[PDB]
Amino acid sequence: ANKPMQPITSTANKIVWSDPTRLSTTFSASLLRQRVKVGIAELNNVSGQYVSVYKRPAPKPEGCADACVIMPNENQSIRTVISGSAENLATLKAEWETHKRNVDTLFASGNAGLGFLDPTAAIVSSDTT
Amino acid sequence: ANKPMQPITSTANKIVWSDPTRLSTTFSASLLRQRVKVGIAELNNVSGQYVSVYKRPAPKPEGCADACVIMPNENQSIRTVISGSAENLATLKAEWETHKRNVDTLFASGNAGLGFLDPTAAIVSSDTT
Amino acid sequence: ANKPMQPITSTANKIVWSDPTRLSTTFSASLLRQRVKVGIAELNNVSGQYVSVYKRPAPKPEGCADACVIMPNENQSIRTVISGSAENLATLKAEWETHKRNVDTLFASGNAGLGFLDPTAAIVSSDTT
Amino acid sequence: ANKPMQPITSTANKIVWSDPTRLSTTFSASLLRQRVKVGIAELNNVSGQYVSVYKRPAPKPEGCADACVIMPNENQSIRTVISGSAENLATLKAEWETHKRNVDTLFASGNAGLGFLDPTAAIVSSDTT
Amino acid sequence: ANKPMQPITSTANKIVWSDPTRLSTTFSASLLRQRVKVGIAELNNVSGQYVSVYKRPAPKPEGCADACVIMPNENQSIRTVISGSAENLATLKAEWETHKRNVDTLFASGNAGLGFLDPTAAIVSSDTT
RNA sequence: CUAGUACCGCGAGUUAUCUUGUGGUAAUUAAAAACUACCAGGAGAUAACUUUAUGAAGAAAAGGACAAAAGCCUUGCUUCC
């Protein structure tokens, strides 16, 4: 039951969503479409840039029930860019799906968030046996 | 019990742990292997430096309960460097054990931390009778 | 038991012990008291340096050995420094055994003295669960 | 009873005592030994400077005590210098004995502490009748 | 049952092992991967430098092992370099296997180790009849 | 008192972090009086680099004599620093 956003800046190359209850949080997606001559063939390349921004209150040190004592907000941001030829969209979606698993198995379930990299983490590619 | 730290940076020359609860707490172990020349014999020397760091906020003058403002924190650092030939590790451990007791006599049980030195403390060497 | 040392050089800040039978073995403790001031608080910082020195003969020809080979000697040293304010000394002692515990589980039980590092070793915090 | 101090800095001339509970409380003694000649005979004069320092917090309460209003300390210093040849040390102790009573009359029992001189106060000499 | 080693230092392109009992013994594996351009047949090349180092004491005089006399150890080194395209690795393994056969002919079975070269020994090709 | 005895010092620079806090930049103030935002900056603690004490090591490419070279030298790079 997440709060849905509404578009704010609608443009042929950029749309920004923001939450009515919390105007601070945003999610903006921008596309840059380009035509590429990779070799003896002309191809249409697209680079979609998706960024989600959230301003959250700081840790709120313990034993501080007082309401109007207010801390500043840090910067929780996530940026993603997807670059690939349009005709290879079907196989590109496989890349996006497996990219999520690699990040999740390394950061979500792993400890990459705290700042530690696990060389023995098991990550796999899109290609299957 | 105690919350176990988890490594944040790992390297064959140094490893740094940190408390996931608070990142200020730190315990870093570093090594410096060295090949040391003695009389017609070559011996492998290892010098391991171990540092434990804690940020403790103020002494918090008692009487009144703490108002919710952060106290500037001081550094409580314990640094330990152990140097010796690798092959004499068996006897160096005994030297480490008696070293712990000697410091405990001066500091854990004495008033060394307050800045006082007792020239009558009982100090026992690694060699036994 | 172990042979006690007697004080050698009683200085304003440094006292050095030494075994009467073996003058090579020493245990010197030096104190440095500093006047440090933090936010609206006056602190007495104490940095205690403790050095344990032992000169150990070489591994001694393996296989066997007589009682007249007398190999050269090599330096075994252990230095620890304890830095912090005396105002919160009682809690400063808390990480001392924790620092003792962390090094023991990493160097005594482990093989860090040889030159190895164990990124998966159990390192526990001073604070309690 | 009274909490004893421990020596801090030891020197051939000066030794400083400080209280473990209150590091600021201080009793320092410094001696300057010198040879002087008056009746074509050398005399070994000893000058002993004794200083006692305490930091009494000024009378903070004004009806209101409160948990943690902390207002600064004041200087309470007592310095005594004892001079005279060690040859007449036996009678010089009696001089110290008399000096104590004379000061006690003016200050300990009288109102010299308030800042008043009593001309008719009873003052007696070391020499007895 | 040969003694197993564990890695000493890790690097992006270098791993070394050493025996805990004897730190002198080492085994270094270093890789160098580089992009090789060919006649419009792109290839990936690797260069593996494998070094085995042993410090062995010089041979004691014949007919006497009793006397625990230590000769200064000498350096024994075996270094191997493998270069080739990763695509042709499968047949390159046969190259390595054949290389062993030729060396064993001169070195192990033969006496090329003593400094004597035999232009008669059978040297077989990698490919089969 | 002064051959000695004995006594004294332990530190460089740059950068960042924390604490203290000298001035300046403007505000309320007739005001750089004093609180505030920034900088410079005296001081104490910590971290990184050149280099100090005193620095030391790790070859793998190049040139130097030479066959374009390696082995004899240094430099690229790194380590506590």
Numbering used by the authors:
A (entry chain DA), B (entry chain GK), C (entry chain GX), D (entry chain GY), E (entry chain GL): 1 to 129
Article sentences:
Single-stranded RNA bacteriophages (ssRNA phages) are positive-sense RNA viruses that have shown specificity for gram-negative bacteria by exploiting host retractile pili, including T4P6. Acinetobacters have type IV pili (T4P), which are involved in twitching motility, surface adhesion, biofilm formation, and natural transformation in gram-negative bacteria. Our study delves into the interaction between Acinetobacter phage AP205 and type IV pili.
The smaller proportion of particles exhibiting a defined RNA organization, in contrast to MS2 (>90%)18 and Qβ (~30%), may be due to the more heterogeneous RNA conformations inside the capsid. Nonetheless, we achieved a 3.1Å-resolution asymmetric reconstruction of the mature AP205 virion, enabling us to construct a complete atomic model of both the capsid protein shell and the gRNA, which consists of 4,269 nucleotides. Surprisingly in contrast to MS2 and Qβ, which have a single Mat per virion, AP205 possesses a distinctive Mat-dimer, resembling the shape of the letter “F” at a pseudo two-fold axis of the capsid and increasing the length of the virion for an additional 70 Å. The two copies of Mat exhibit different conformations: One Mat (referred as outer Mat) extends further to elevate its apical domain away from the capsid shell while the other Mat (referred as inner Mat) is embedded deeper within the capsid and has a larger bending angle between the central and basal domains. These two Mat proteins intertwine to form hydrogen bonds and salt bridges at three sites. The third interaction is within a six-helix bundle between the two basal domains, connected by a salt bridge between Asp321 (α5 of the outer Mat) and Arg347 (α5 of the inner Mat). These interactions hold the two copies of AP205 Mat together, forming a dimer that nearly triples the volume and doubles the surface area compared to a single Mat in ssRNA coliphages. The 3’ region of the gRNA is proximal to the Mat-dimer on one side of the capsid, while the 5’ region resides on the opposite side. Notably, one RNA stem-loop originating from the 3’ end of the AP205 gRNA, which interacts with the Mat-dimer, is partially exposed outside the capsid shell.
